[PDB]
Task: structure prediction
Amino acid sequence: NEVVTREYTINIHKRIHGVGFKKRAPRALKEIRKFAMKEMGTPDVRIDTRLNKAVWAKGIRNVPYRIRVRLSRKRNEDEDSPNKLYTLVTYVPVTTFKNLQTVNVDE
Amino acid sequence: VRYSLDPENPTKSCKSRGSNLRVHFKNTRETAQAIKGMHIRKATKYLKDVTLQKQCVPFRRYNGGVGRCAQAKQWGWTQGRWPKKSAEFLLHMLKNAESNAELKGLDVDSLVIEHIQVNKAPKMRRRTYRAHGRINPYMSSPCHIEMILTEKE
Amino acid sequence: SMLRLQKRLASSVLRCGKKKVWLDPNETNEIANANSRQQIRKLIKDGLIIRKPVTVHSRARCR
Amino acid sequence: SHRKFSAPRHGSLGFLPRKRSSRHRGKVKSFPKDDPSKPVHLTAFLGYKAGMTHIVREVDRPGSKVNKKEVVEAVTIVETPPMVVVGIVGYVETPRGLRTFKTVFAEHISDECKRRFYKNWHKSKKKAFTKYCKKWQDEDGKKQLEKDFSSMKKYCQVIRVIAHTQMRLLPLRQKKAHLMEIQVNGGTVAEKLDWARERLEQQVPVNQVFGQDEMIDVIGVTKGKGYKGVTSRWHTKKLPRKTHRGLRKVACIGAWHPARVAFSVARAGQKGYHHRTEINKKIYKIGQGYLIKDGKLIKNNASTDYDLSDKSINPLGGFVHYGEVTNDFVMLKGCVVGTKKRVLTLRKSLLVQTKRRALEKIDLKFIDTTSKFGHGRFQTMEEKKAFMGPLKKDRIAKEEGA
RNA sequence: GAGAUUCCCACUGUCCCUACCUACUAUCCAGCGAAACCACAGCCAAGGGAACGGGCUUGGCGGAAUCAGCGGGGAAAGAAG
RNA sequence: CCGCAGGUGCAGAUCUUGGUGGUAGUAGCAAAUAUUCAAACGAGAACUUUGAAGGCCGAAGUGGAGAAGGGUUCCAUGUGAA
Ligand SMILES: [Mg+2]
Ligand SMILES: [Mg+2]
Ligand SMILES: [Mg+2]
Ligand SMILES: [Mg+2]
Ligand SMILES: [Mg+2]
Ligand SMILES: [Mg+2]
Ligand SMILES: [Mg+2]
Ligand SMILES: [Mg+2]
Ligand SMILES: [Mg+2]
Ligand SMILES: [Mg+2]
Ligand SMILES: [Mg+2]
Ligand SMILES: [Mg+2]
Ligand SMILES: [Mg+2]
Ligand SMILES: [Mg+2]
Ligand SMILES: [Mg+2]
Ligand SMILES: [Mg+2]
Result:
């Protein structure tokens, strides 16, 4: 299918390790976008403002180590665009990250 | 207007021109040398790849201080770059030339860039300020560009 | 489109700073049509322009 | 005028092309001198630097302060899975040097060996040696191969075997095997050709090439350090703090005359990743590797005659930045050039070992297997569990296991 | 006493003897884009020579186009000492 | 061509004026902690606007108003040449 939506968890700690203080949250957004592109094969990746707030919750340098996100591939068939598919990345609040798998989520 | 290198048969050929274009003459000359002789579709996709930094133009004559890249090995060279503005200007000129070919009624799937030439335009003066109350030039280096496409397959 | 004038007029009418002026991000065209302080007042009455509350500076810790 | 006080030169001019090595493997460049009196043997081997640890042993050096005493000595582990012989090269002596006369490759060249011949194995059609291997079957190709062997027998002076490592037995990412010409010494050309031809397509373990407590040479490429300045590269004196344009420099790079910068002046550039050959590294141990007869055997790697502890050479939590060692390994004495999982060449000594440092029997009493991924303090999992007792995660696992 | 000098205690990378880390650069890229300087130019040894040559003589030799550094030379530049 | 008369011949003068190179797509665009997400307009958005978030000035301010000085820079609309 191509209108699939899945729930992933991302090791922001792993993807941000080594980045300077004033760059950690922007680089976390860039790595989330790159992760979405790699997983869903869509150059068009939109990041929800709630997800952006979740990443920036603890300031610019103390980004959360792990984050639970939901990647939804959706039809871009609303206008004449080079890409007919886009990935919306939303924020999934969780209480713990233990034993969380990548799961297909229904409609 | 007078082009240099008039076509051998001005019925299988179309022309494009631009004057006082605000792009760097050296980068544009290197890009034109890169796309010279290409089929029009190949040149279009190559210029798009240059904009996307997937193919480089080799800097052969104006290579002072130009860094090395892995994509320069496609050409017999070592130094290459990705002049985005030169690529976009040449893409606009190629679209204009393809429209001229459409107007002349010759199919645009067999056009090859046989002539392309970049000339220096009159420089435009701006001003910069130096250490001890001194003024120095901040010239631009615009270029005229011309190209002649010809049908062959 | 560009609502610098509307933000300035809303600040002047609401007697607050431009920090506290909230323009509706969805009714951009309706706010952009407002070029006078009467129209700014009408938008304030209709709820498209809102004075945001003062950022909380509590004194409970001090007490 | 002369410099006011004498000081020895910084660095050695014997390594002047202080450049990145053109090779990654490390080539022998001098095999041991061949004498026909000795039996037929190989002169070198390929291993992979797994990591370092330390051992406890009793010294048998009379007249020393450490005579009959216990010492702790640093050792390097070099994983050495058996080489596979896939070819034979003959060389002929000419007034211009040794030149390659004929190369004969075996049938059934391994897949990992064939990977060496391709820059992009993924896109390849895997066609290497496919037409060559067909000549091992037809009568024409067999006659041509016999003529090649006879020509090697009657014309070549020294022969070498092509041997490759076995990537599939290593925990590394790389699947491309390492090829190497290893010289065969000790006999007539006919005898060494017969020996090599019998060893074609076969596996040579490291214990057939090297023995216990002998001193060998290690050849390899050192750790790369990138572009470095004079203070880190040539270890020149740092200039005083008051220096204007920089203190990590060489102040004078030459006199007014000879009006050029000499080649002997310390200057910044590449440091590390240099090809080096260190001689006289003693083999403290040749480990036996993992077996499965009825159960998996790991004692033969780190258990000594005084330890009797069922443990392997692998530290607690594994070798850092390498993986787990499961094949034959060589416990050498001291440090060895290169990073972890760097390929090293082990070569027989070119010299005659007569000093009492050499030919000294090595008897290990203890091999350290504490975790190197921190300040490890337990030799084995069982010892750690016995010391710390049950834990919370063990309790919650046993609660579910009833 | 932001005055000149000597010694002592304490203190420390001033040093033995250097190492590592951080920020901004440098570096690579997109865009933009100067100046100083310039007989011609630019590999050496010796010779002779305005008595210390890049050019001349005699020899050594010499392989496109370049990148990052560097401070030996250009008796480098800066100013009719 | 015959005579007559000169402000009559340039490589230099650190010559005068003008133009153009190499240098060179080089030096450089590094003082004062910092930006991110979405949307709108638009051919075109790192820089515009709106909203959300994270920060800074921290009342001796990066706030609010004047004197001198400037002189229309003030305000609205439009343009995208320089
Ligand atoms: Mg340069
Ligand atoms: Mg300036
Ligand atoms: Mg001034
Ligand atoms: Mg002396
Ligand atoms: Mg000073
Ligand atoms: Mg350790
Ligand atoms: Mg000379
Ligand atoms: Mg004078
Ligand atoms: Mg004077
Ligand atoms: Mg005159
Ligand atoms: Mg003149
Ligand atoms: Mg630059
Ligand atoms: Mg800069
Ligand atoms: Mg503050
Ligand atoms: Mg004020
Ligand atoms: Mg104004």
Summary: Chains C and D do not touch (no CB pair under 8 Å). Residues 8 and 32 of chain C are 12 Å apart (CA to CA). The first strand of chain C starts at residue 21 and ends at 23. The helical segments of chain C are 4-14, 28-32, 37-46.
